Amino acid sequence: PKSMQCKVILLDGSEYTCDVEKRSRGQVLFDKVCEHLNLLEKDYFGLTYRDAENQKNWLDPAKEIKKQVRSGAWHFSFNVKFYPPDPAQLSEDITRYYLCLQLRDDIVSGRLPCSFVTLALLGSYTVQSELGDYDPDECGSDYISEFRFAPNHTKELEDKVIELHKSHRGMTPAEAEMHFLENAKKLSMYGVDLHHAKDSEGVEIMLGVCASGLLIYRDRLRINRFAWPKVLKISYKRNNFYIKIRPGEFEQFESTIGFKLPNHRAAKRLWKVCVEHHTFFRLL
Ligand SMILES: Fc1cccnc1NCC1CCOCC1
Numbered sequence: 001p002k003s004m005q006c007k008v009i010l011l012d013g014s015e016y017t018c019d020v021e022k023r024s025r026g027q028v029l030f031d032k033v034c035e036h037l038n039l040l041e042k043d044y045f046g047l048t049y050r051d052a053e054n055q056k057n058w059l060d061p062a063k064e065i066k067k068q069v070r071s072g073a074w075h076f077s078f079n080v081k082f083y084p085p086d087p088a089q090l091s092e093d094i095t096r097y098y099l100c101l102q103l104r105d106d107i108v109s110g111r112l113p114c115s116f117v118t119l120a121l122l123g124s125y126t127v128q129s130e131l132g133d134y135d136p137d138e139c140g141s142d143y144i145s146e147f148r149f150a151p152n153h154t155k156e157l158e159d160k161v162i163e164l165h166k167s168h169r170g171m172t173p174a175e176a177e178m179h180f181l182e183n184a185k186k187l188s189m190y191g192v193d194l195h196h197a198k199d200s201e202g203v204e205i206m207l208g209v210c211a212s213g214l215l216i217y218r219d220r221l222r223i224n225r226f227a228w229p230k231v232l233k234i235s236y237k238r239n240n241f242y243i244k245i246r247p248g249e250f251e252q253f254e255s256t257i258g259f260k261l262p263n264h265r266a267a268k269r270l271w272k273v274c275v276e277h278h279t280f281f282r283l284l
Contacts, residue, residue, distance in 0.1 A: 001021050002021065002022045003019040003020060003021055003022065004019065004020060004021075004022045004024075004065070004066075004074050005017060005018075005074060006018050006019070006020060006029050006032075006065075006074045006075075006076065007073075007074065007075050007076070008029075008033050008047065008075075008077065008078055009076070009077045009078065010033075010037070010078050011078055011079070011098055011101035011102055011105065012101060016033060016036050016078075018033075020032070020065065022066060023064055023066065024064070024065055025061060025062060025063060025064060025065070026047065026059040026060055026061040026062070026063060026065055026068065027061035027062065028065075029059070029065060029076070030042070030045075030046070030047055030059070030061050033047065033078055037078070037094075037098065038094055039095065039098060040091075040092060040094075040095075041090055041091060041092055041095040043280075044080055044081065044082045044083070044084060044090075044095065044099070045078065045079065045080060045081055046058050046059065046061070046079060046081035047059040047076040047077065047078060047079070048076060048077045048079050049068065049069055049072065049075065049076050049077075050072070050075070051072060051265075052071075052072070055265075055266075055269075056077075057269060058081060058272070058273070058276075059076060079102060080098070080099055080102040080103075080191075081276070082191075082211070082276075082277070082280045082281075083099070083190060083191025083210070083211065084099070084211075084284075085185065085191075085211045085212070085284075086185070087099055087178070087181040087182075087185060088178060088181070088182070093173075093174040093177070096174070096177050096181055097173075097177055099181060100126070100129070100177045100180050100181065103122075103180070103181075104122075104126060104148070107119065107122065107149070107150065107151075107184075108148045108149070108150065108151060110151040111189070111194075112184070112187055112189050112190065113187070113188075113189055114150070116156075116157065116160070117160070118183060119149055119150045119157055120149075120157055120160035120161050120163075120164055121164055121183055122149070122180055122183055122184060123145070123147065123149035123150075123157070123160075123161040123164075124161050124162075124163075124164030124165045124167070124168060125168070125171075125176040125177070125180035125183075126147055126149070126176075126180065127145065127147060127161060127165045128165060128168040128173075128176040129173040129176040129177050129180070130147070130173075132173075133168075133169050133170065134162070134165045134166045134168070139162055143158060143162060144158050145158060145161060147161075149161060189208075191210045191211060192208040192209070192210045192215065193208065193209040193210065193273055194206050194207070194208050195207045195208075195209070195261070195266070195269075195270045195273075196261075196266075197241065197259040197260060197261055197270075198259065198260035199216075199218070199258075199259060199260075200257075200258050200259075200260075202260070205217055205218055205259070207259065207270065209273050209274055209277050210277065211277070211280075211281045211284070212225070212227060212228070212281075213225060213226045213227045213228045213230070214226045214228075214231065214243065214274065216257075226243065226245055228277070228278050228281055228282060229246075230245055230246050231243055231244070231245065231246075231274075231278060232244045232245075232246055234271055234274045234275055234278065235271065236261075236264075236267040236270070236271040237267075238264055238267070239260055239261050239262070239263055239264055239266075239267055240258055240259065240260060240261070240267060241258070241259045241261055241267045241270050241271060242256055242257070242258050242259075243257050243274075244256060245257060
């Protein structure tokens with residue numbers, strides 16, 4: 001029975017290596033990674049791979065790994081797929097811990113924009129969770145943390161992290177992680193997966209996919225939001241992505257909004273993440 005070596009980048013930046021039979025489904029590898037992580041609340045998470053143009057795709061757990069990675073390396077990342085709108089309702093601290101690690105990367109990467117004060121508050125909770133109580137012996141007036149807190153670090157941000165860290169004396173890791181999540185969950189781009197698109201007039205937009213529904217960023221003054229229950233059908237054809245928006249009360253007919261995606265694969269990817277979010281957040 002022939003086995004393929006898999007390498008998975010974990011959310012702490014470390015690499016897990018294992019072997020699966022070459023005709024394995026994605027679920028087989030995912031179960032091995034989750035057992036390694038001592039993760040029970042697995043439904044929120046998934047594995048991603050990078051294709052030819054370094055674009056992220058979700059590894060479908062129900063399909064053969066080889067029919068997804070195709071010509072590419074068996075290299076994956078472990079990621080949050082479905083961001084819980086209320087992380088306090090997760091059953092396990094370790095689930096909230098992995099969600100914190102994902103969100104720290106969301107922040108440092110700039111996928112999750114954040115005010116100065118929120119960057120410093122989130123940073124202060126991470127430090128409290130990881131080092132425990134503030135100690136002056138490690139931090140002088142010229143302290144710079146090993147922790148990456150932001151897309152761009154400043155001495156002012158490092159100072160503010162330390163000032164807030166002093167306020168958290170006696171806070172346990174689980175407690176600090178829950179505070180981190182209570183703040184992060186409120187950010188306007190929390191759990192929003194952004195896709196580049198053009199509207200029916202060729203104007204550049206972004207489509208955001210999240211728990212609450214589909215967001216269309218038209219401009220800074222115009223953001224259209226379609227709650228999942230207002231969405232009846234999602235479809236793709238060639239480079240195009242379509243949603244069927246319910247008739248409001250007393251309307252005879254559904255409305256159709258069409259989008260142009262960069263290519264057919266980008267249309268299919270957007271369709272599948274929308275279907276998965278619609279299903280997941282219909283059941284929560
Ligand atoms: F409305 C727009 C049209 C075209 C490009 N960008 C747009 N908005 C910028 C934001 C939208 C989501 O948050 C981060 C980027």
